[PDB]
Ligand binder design. Structure first.
Ligand SMILES: CC(C)(C)/[N+]([O-])=C/c1cc[n+]([O-])cc1
Ligand SMILES: CC(C)(C)/[N+]([O-])=C/c1cc[n+]([O-])cc1
Ligand SMILES: CC(C)(C)/[N+]([O-])=C/c1cc[n+]([O-])cc1
Ligand SMILES: CC(C)(C)/[N+]([O-])=C/c1cc[n+]([O-])cc1
Ligand SMILES: O=c1[nH]c(=O)c2nc[nH]c2[nH]1
Ligand SMILES: O=c1[nH]c(=O)c2nc[nH]c2[nH]1
Ligand SMILES: O=c1[nH]c(=O)c2nc[nH]c2[nH]1
Ligand SMILES: O=c1[nH]c(=O)c2nc[nH]c2[nH]1
Ligand code: NA
Ligand code: NA
Ligand code: NA
Ligand code: NA
Lengths: 295, 295, 295, 295
């Protein structure tokens, strides 16, 4: 037998950073969870009990904190590129570094109509994420995403015209609830290295903002024929607004809200045009995925 | 042996309701999770296999949906009072109904600067809750709360002057991070019944809003001597602004953010005035509780 | 305003302990999560920013570890009594200590039919818990429990003869699945102090074992008329086997498994005597509670 | 723009099945969670609002239940192969079916030393899983796994001889705790279709049993030089015992248990040979991965 693939490192590394403006007194906070897994000439740690090739996972943890102290942590695409580049440059025998970052929201509070200099709120579990793969000889591959963006529209969603056979019970509908948890990922052109990533830094926050704005406006304004049709419109608009992304991927659950027939009780009418009270269903759920690229 | 206490019912009942304005086209949504547990002359279901005294939990579930169809679901204090009153009035042998409601956020989206008529976002897992105990012969006891309001301030928190003995290692500090998940509960005066609850309906949303505003402004503006001192100021202000509440309770974790000494690495300075990068700690956590009433 | 109630301390303190027999080489492990909250003359920490009365929560954490080093951690009733007694004896102004302990399973592995000296498996998330309230001048109040014991029987559960009215849709049944997560708590006679707790130490593990054995045998062998009827039989047997407990409480969800009518598909028969495939329901769920004492 | 990849279906489908022996009275239960995602000529559902190509996710759900009624649900490799084959044979335009199954434990209870005919316990959240990819023209690709197998050994784990530089603080150790959650996956040779899967049916349960037995015996008996070294020994033994698997993959967290220095308190000795009480760490955690194949 032989090792065909291997990677190891430190997961679930929580990191906070503060920036303090001492002339204005304004503070800004950043919080993330980081994972770094390394690849390289490490097979003998597995086959021969040779730990000399292991950069200890504790040391990887230390390196995350040191890198955050000495470098910007925003945008996360940049921080992950800096961090992954470090491992392949510092260690001759390490040839790839896989950096995953989850960014947590800390939104400045408004108090009596004025932004507060040092107080923040977690407005939602929506995350901004990156996956940064730094591969020696191959450059830096970045996937950026937003996840956990939970939305609902109460009308202007439809689902009719689907295949019907002996397995089908679902009724067609011209007016339903649509609710989902948005997971949207944009895949950047390969970067040759850290210099090229730095050259595009303003594009990372701009493109996250565009993706979020397109997602919300299209969800709200599309009189949706299906999750499939609406998600494609989102993806195509994001591609049209950033030439440096190659693909946009969505993964969307269809979090079902079922009508409740109450007509067995005093003739109460709660279906169709009379539908007011619904039963949100925890499981099962539809799951719809698409990756859109340029022709 | 004998039954000393018993209650039973249906938990984890998810409920959605929509309101549609057909003149303006504006829709508004409400979503909750409901639990109803009943008490009364039910002991023989336990001791003698006598199911005649059991209102089936499935029937309790049906009743929740019917009640939501026929009545307002907001404010939740009102809905829970309506629902609990129903069981003690409908069933002679049922003498108490315990109704817990968790309200989930669906905040109207703003699209290009204008509120959208039918699209919503889950801005945060913060909940608005009620516990409504309807007890025949004793009235209606309501506890209202906000929970899951997660906040952080980056300075203007201190903790010094605590007891020091042979168990103490913690250093005093004049500048630390303070972060918590706010659980705040206000206990209303006993209401004699549903009519009295209805008479105070505008006070429920007003008091929730006051509690939230006081919590956030006091957290943001208090140069905090301890979690204890800051939470008391919140509670006293809420009591001063609503005569119909008797007590305010807070339960606050102290979600610790630890400094990280990096001076073992190239003399890097990351403590005290130089502290920039911190390690958020998942566990353990301080837990601080207070119930404040009027003198 | 004034403080009506207050308690504070450290929650979510994870603790492991090992015992090593150096003559036999046999090691035994214990793992728990501990919470300690203190009460006493602490109100001025809230009202006057007086931290002198605060035993820091960090110091409470240290004390948990020190107590585990110097004392047995099993049975948990004993450890919690030792720990809570410490705070009210050490600190004049602390008058109650509330200790909650969750014990995690580490069951010795059997390897080729022989118990292994130092390897363990988490067989299940079932917990053994205690709540120990040490109150100066009032003694020690102990509640012991098992929780997270998840069971299912595929027949010999019935539910018929319940109340039927205009809210009722549930069909009677003479053969259903019954599945639950057992939460069972036994409340000990008040103990005067730590000496009396020590005098009864063998009874704690014995009574936990009896409660577990009675729960499982009664669940398995009762042709159940309802959750209510079966849980009462468990409670009465536990009371009959330990004179030093005053009450037994059960809290049992009814985790529903719904029949699936497939007769719309090729006449397939999957209900009643033909029921083979079921849909487990995540929510809602029945919730049935009882506290049983002696007459 | 154009669709580059797409799949859709139903996730989180809970399924129970019972087998009843009416001659012996012995019942046996099976419970799973299923996901089915389909691929094929579905792009126009995304780009042109053409729902004619969509097999509704509700219909996929129905099909899961029907398939479980008409076919064995064990071993899960077989059930998933049957289910995925159905979609590519039934629907001309569907060309792949991706079936994921999580099997939940229901272990028969022993009551007074005898196996009970119809009562079961969830002994642990350990899962047995399959991923079955049925691809028209390409056969059936099966990955089998066990996950959530949580273990701890209290000695006979070491970690020394790792790389040391200016990022390293970790001390070498010759005696530590090792605890992990085992995720082990075995990748079968490609099968040409359902007939070939059926021909190997006894091998699926046999190989799961071998993987579990090898994992536990090797964990318990290896005086471990690292997680890396121990996991490789497991993988090589599993490959040696089943010629029809091509690779074995492990993913193992190193769930750290930290020593607690108490010597600041009365000189208490709790490190090194005196280490008795430890602090389990929830995060961060090492994460070690390997894929082993044959040379
Ligand atoms: C995944 C883990 C448990 C390491 N985590 O990131 C936890 C966490 C992150 C952020 N906030 O606010 C709370 C907890
Ligand atoms: C407690 C349970 C599982 C019943 N629940 O309420 C779930 C739930 C409620 C609201 N949202 O948005 C998601 C899930
Ligand atoms: C409640 C917290 C998060 C502190 N906890 O006890 C976690 C925990 C305990 C035991 N095991 O095996 C895993 C995690
Ligand atoms: C993933 C979901 C929520 C669908 N699930 O499988 C839940 C579940 C499965 C098995 N048991 O025992 C409890 C819950
Ligand atoms: O938008 C939708 N897309 C689908 O594929 C689907 N199937 C059932 N319900 C559905 N909804
Ligand atoms: O605000 C605080 N209150 C306390 O009781 C405490 N103890 C440690 N750290 C603390 N912080
Ligand atoms: O055992 C049971 N007890 C009940 O109260 C109940 N109601 C519905 N289903 C039920 N099952
Ligand atoms: O077994 C181990 N493998 C590692 O790579 C590691 N690094 C720190 N601690 C470790 N343990
Ligand atoms: Na390198
Ligand atoms: Na009544
Ligand atoms: Na005292
Ligand atoms: Na096909």
């Amino acid at each position: 037998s032989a090792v065909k693939a291997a990677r190891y490192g430190k997961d679930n590394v929580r990191v906070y950073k503060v920036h303090k403006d001492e002339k204005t007194g304004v503070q800004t906070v950043y919080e993330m969870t980081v994972c770094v897994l390394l690849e390289g000439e490490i097979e003998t740690s597995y086959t021969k009990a040779d730990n000399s090739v292991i950069v200890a996972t504790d040391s990887i943890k230390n390196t995350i904190y040191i890198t955050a102290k000495q470098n910007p942590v925003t945008p996360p695409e940049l921080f992950g590129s800096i961090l992954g580049t470090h491992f392949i440059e510092k260690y001759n025998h390490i040839h790839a570094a896989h950096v995953n970052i989850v960014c947590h929201r800390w939104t400045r509070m408004d108090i009596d109509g004025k932004p507060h200099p040092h107080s923040f709120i977690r407005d939602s579990e929506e995350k901004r994420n990156v996956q940064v793969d730094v591969v020696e000889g191959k450059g830096i591959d970045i996937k950026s995403s937003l996840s956990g963006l939970t939305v609902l529209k109460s009308t202007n969603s439809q689902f009719w015209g689907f295949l019907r056979d002996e397995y089908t019970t679902l009724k067609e509908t011209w007016d339903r609830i649509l609710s989902t948890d948005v997971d949207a990922t944009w895949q950047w052109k390969n970067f040759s290295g850290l210099q090229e990533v730095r050259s595009h830094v303003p594009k990372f926050d701009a493109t996250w903002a565009t993706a979020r704005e397109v997602t919300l406006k299209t969800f709200a304004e599309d009189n949706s024929a299906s999750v499939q049709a609406t998600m494609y419109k989102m993806a195509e608009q994001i591609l049209a607004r950033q030439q440096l992304i190659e693909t946009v991927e969505y993964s969307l659950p269809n979090k079902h809200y079922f009508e409740i027939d109450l007509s067995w009780h005093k003739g109460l009418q709660n279906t169709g045009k009379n539908a007011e009270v619904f039963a949100p269903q925890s499981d099962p759920n539809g799951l719809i995925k698409c990756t859109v690229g340029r022709s």
